[PDB]
Subunit: 147 residues, 6 copies
C-alpha cells in the first residue's frame, strides 16, 4: 500500500515540473528522508542520457558508487523512463530526433510497510524533436524500481 | 517554439497531479483558451482505458464527436501515452497486471506561432500492479499530437 | 540477385491491389510457375487473421498441409506482414481497433539462380480503425520468407 | 468513409510499384488534387532515409517548409512506414542490414467528407538485405497520418 | 564479478535441461545455498504462465509471500524470460501460438562480494507452436533481476 | 513431433554451457549427423555479433557460403536469439550496455519425420552489463529457424 504522503513517483514529477522552487523543494524532500538528484541533459544519443543520469545519481549519493546491485536498479528504472520519452523505439539520433531533458532521481520507501525498503524513481521531462530548435514538443518518462 | 506559458504537456500533468484544486484549475485553464477533460478508469483491459478516454473527451467537447480526423489524433496520443504506462508491451491483464489511472486531455496551441493550430495531450497517472491491491506502484504516460 | 520479372513481393501486391472485374492475373502468374492464393478477412482478433491466411494457403496448395516446415515458413511471413499493419503493437481488438483485410499469398522462386529455391510472400491490404465503419484509414503489410 | 477513387494508401503504392509511367502517373494524380513526391534512397542509417523523405517532401511542396505541424505529421507517417520495412526493430545497419528504397509521399483528402481535411501517405519499396548486393529481398512500408 | 561456481543463470538452465536427475540437482543446489523452484505449464495465455511461476515460487519459499518487493523482482525477471520465448511480441494465443513449458526459479547471490545480495533467475524451456502437437519447436527464456 | 534424442535447441545449449576441458561433445554430435559451430564474441555493437556468428557458421560449413537462402535462415535465427539477450530493445552500445558472449550454431533435423528437412539453432550465452568488467550479469538466447 502506497503511503499517500510518500508517492515517490508523483513527488519526483512535481519536483521536475516546478521551476520557481529548486533548492526549496529538494531540502524539504531530503528532510523527509528522500535522497534527491537533479540534472539536465540534451543529446541525440540515449547512452549519454543514461550516462548523465547514472553519473549525477552516484555523485549526489542517490545510489552507491560501488557494486552492481544499485547501479542495476538505476539502469532499469532509466530504461523504463526512456520508454515514455521514446514511445516505441528507444532511439533518438538514429531516427533523426533529439531530446532536451530535465531529470530527477528519488530514493526511499514509498510504502506504509517499512519492510518494503528502498525504491527509486527516474523522471524525465523536456522536449523531443528534429535537429532544429522550435520543431519539437514535450515528452515525459517515469521509471520505478526496487533497490 | 513552445510558448513558456502554454506548455500543454506540463500543464496537463500538473492538473493530473494536483488533488487540492480540481475545478479551480480547470476553470483557469479554460479561461486561458484550453479545452480540458478529466476522468478516471481502473481496468486490466487497455481497450477500456482507451474507450474511457475517448468517451470522456467527446462528451466534454475536447474533440469533435463527428468525423474521423480528430478521433484519430486522440487515438494516437493515447497510444503514445500508454507507452509510458506499459513500458514495453502495451498489455495489461494478459501480462497479469492492472492499472488504476487518472487522466487529463488538453487541446489548444502550445506554440508562439498561431499558425501551428491546435494540439492535444493525453496524460495518465496512477498505479500498475498485480490483481491485488497494495502490490503495485506508480505509472505515468503522456502523449502529444497535432489536431 | 532478384529476377526483374519475378519479384514475388511486387507481384503479390499488384495482384492484391487490382480490383479488375475480369480475372486475368491469377491465371497468368500460375502459368509462369507461381502458386497463388487470395482471401479476405475482417476481424478484431489477430489470430483469426493468421488462421484464415494459413487455411486459404493450404486449401489452394500454396504450402503443404502435412508437416510443420512449410507452415512455419508461412507463419513468419504472416507475422512479418502484420508488422506493416499494426505498426508497433501486434494487437487489434485489445487496442480497440479492427481490420478489414484482403490478402495475397505468392509462392515461388524470385531469384535468377534456381539454387535459391522457393520463397513465399504474404501481402495484406484493407483498413484499420475503430469498431465503427468509416472511422478508419488504409493499412499495408508485406512479409517475405524462404521455404 | 474512404472515397473509392481517392484511396491515398493504395494509390501511393501503385504509384511506387509501376515503372512504365513516371510523369504520366504523377500528373494524373496532381490534376486530381493530390500533392505528390517521389524519391530513391539507399542507406544503412534510418535517419538518412527519414531526412531524404522530409527534404524531398519540403522541396516538392507536399508539406510546408515553415512550421512544425506538417513536419510532425510527415515524421510520424514515415515512422509508421519504417515499421513495415524493419518489421520489429527500427534498425538497419546496427543489425547488419541495409536498404535500397524507392519512396512516394501523397498529400490530399481520401474521404467523402471534406471536413476530414488533408492526410499524408508515405510509401516505401525496395530491398532489405546484407551489405552485399543480391543478398537481400523485397520490403514494403506504408504510413498514414492526418495533417 | 560473477562467481564461477554460482552463475545463477547457467545453473538454472542446466537444471532445466537435464531430465535424469531431478531431486539430486535440486538438493545439491539447495545445500549450496540456493533457493530453488521447479514447475511445468502448458498454456496459450501469458498470464497463466506468469501466475504459475509466481505461485510456485511463493509456495516453495523462493520469494516471500508477504509484501510487494520480492513479487516485483520476480515479475520482471519472468517478463525478461518471457522475452526469449515470445521473441518480439509478448503474445501467445492471440498470435495463434501456444506453449508447453518447464520452468525453474533460482534465488541466491551469484557474485563474489556478499554486498551484492540476492538475485533471482527465472528460466523457461519447452515448445512454442501452433495449437496442434508436433506443429512446433523449442523455445528458451532466461530472466535475471536483483531482489 | 520432435525427436527426444534430436532436440536441436536443447542440444545446442548443453553444448554451449559445458566448459569441459576434454573436447567430447562436438565430435559426438557431428557423428550423429549434426553440423556444429562454436565461437565467442564480445562487443557493444550488435552487428559485430551477428557478423561473427555468420562467419563462423560459414567457415565451419554449417550453412552454405554461396547463395542467400541459407544466410537468410541463419540471420533470423540469430535475430530471434538476440531477443532473449536484449529483452526488448535490440540495442547494446547505444543503451550504454555491452555483451561478452559464447555462441553455438547447430544444424540438422530434429523431427521424427525426415520430411521436415534441416533446421538451424543459434544459441547465445555470456554476460551483459555496463562497459566496466564485473558490472554485469548473465544473458541467454536461443533462435531456431528452418532451412
Ligand atoms: N515528434 C517526434 C520527434 C521529432 C522528429 N522530427 C520532428 N519531431 C517524436 O514523437 O519523438
Ligand atoms: N510492476 C509491474 C506490474 C505488476 C505486475 N505484478 C506486480 N506488479 C509493472 O511494471 O507493470
Ligand atoms: N488508426 C489506428 C486504429 C484506430 C482506432 N480507432 C481509430 N483508428 C491505427 O493506426 O491502427
Ligand atoms: N532479410 C533481412 C535482412 C538481411 C540481412 N542479411 C540478410 N538478410 C530482413 O528481414 O531485414
Ligand atoms: N514457431 C512459432 C509459433 C508457431 C505457431 N504456429 C506455427 N509456429 C514461433 O516462433 O512462436
Ligand atoms: N543489466 C542491463 C545491462 C546493463 C547496463 N549497465 C549495467 N547493466 C541489461 O539487462 O541488459
Ligand atoms: Ba519497442
Ligand atoms: Ba513494444
Ligand atoms: Ba513490437
Ligand atoms: Ba528477411
Ligand atoms: Ba511527435
Ligand atoms: Ba518495436
Ligand atoms: Ba492511424
Ligand atoms: Ba514494476
Ligand atoms: Ba516488443
Ligand atoms: Ba539487467
Ligand atoms: Ba522490440
Ligand atoms: Ba518459429
Amino acid at each position: 500500500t502506497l503511503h499517500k504522503e510518500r508517492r515517490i513517483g508523483r513527488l519526483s514529477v512535481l519536483l521536475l515540473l516546478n521551476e520557481a522552487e529548486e533548492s526549496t523543494q529538494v531540502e524539504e524532500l531530503e528532510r523527509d528522508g528522500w535522497k534527491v538528484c537533479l540534472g539536465k541533459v540534451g543529446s541525440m544519443d540515449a547512452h549519454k542520457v543514461i550516462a548523465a543520469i547514472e553519473t549525477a545519481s552516484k555523485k549526489s549519493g542517490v545510489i552507491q558508487s560501488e557494486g552492481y546491485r544499485e547501479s542495476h536498479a538505476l539502469y532499469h528504472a532509466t530504461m523504463e523512463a526512456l520508454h515514455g520519452v521514446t514511445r516505441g523505439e528507444m532511439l533518438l539520433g538514429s531516427l533523426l530526433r533529439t531530446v532536451g531533458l530535465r531529470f530527477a532521481v528519488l530514493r526511499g520507501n514509498p510504502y506504509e510497510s517499512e519492510a518494503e525498503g528502498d525504491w527509486i524513481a527516474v523522471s524525465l521531462y523536456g522536449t523531443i524533436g528534429a535537429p532544429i530548435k522550435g520543431l519539437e514538443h514535450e515528452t515525459f518518462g517515469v521509471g520505478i524500481n526496487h533497490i
